[PDB]
Amino acid sequence: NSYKMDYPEMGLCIIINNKNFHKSTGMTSRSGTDVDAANLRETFRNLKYEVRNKNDLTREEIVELMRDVSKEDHSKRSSFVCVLLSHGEEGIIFGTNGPVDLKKITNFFRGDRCRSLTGKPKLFIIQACRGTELDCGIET
Amino acid sequence: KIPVEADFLYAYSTAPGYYSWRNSKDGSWFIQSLCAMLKQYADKLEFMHILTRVNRKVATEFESFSFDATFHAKKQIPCIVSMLTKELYFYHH
């Protein structure tokens, strides 16, 4: 069957958009990412999600934010959506100043640590590299 | 009771171990596709089927253009990781 999506609210949609990073990281500005963040805001707004855009968050602030969100009351929400736009590696997402493992972020929403979301769909959309391999493709 | 890792869906822009691409003007190939596909099908297609269309769009309509031969003409395929136990629809009854 299907998830119950007829709660008073569809849920929260947290968009973390990191464009500028500290020089120590070695990653130049992620131009075009603002277009993405704006695109996502409008899209989820039409799906009735309460969108909250956050720009340039240090790794500490990303964990701080996710922790706070996982502690809010989602009893009247159907689901949870989180979009992370930033640089990354396998299992890792980058704050403006450093890396943070994705496992640490999603664990705040585990069925046992966020009771108001248990049994509710939790979507994580991740735009970020997961290594350095290149796909050259094949013809048909 | 149910697993604590149940009901999670991870929509990854690219395959494990690979680079993810972004157009310096229009944004990431994945987000563009995701938004077009949602706007077009969120009112009738189940999420997994929508992400499959995003997979096809990104894989077929995008090819990198770079002045650096190393990063030129490269492809990308998104990666859907689902721990969902039910179907996901954004519309109502």
Partner: peptide, 5 residues
């Protein structure tokens, strides 16, 4: 142009 992430 296209760049990697």
């Amino acid at each position: 142009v296209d760049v990697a992430x």
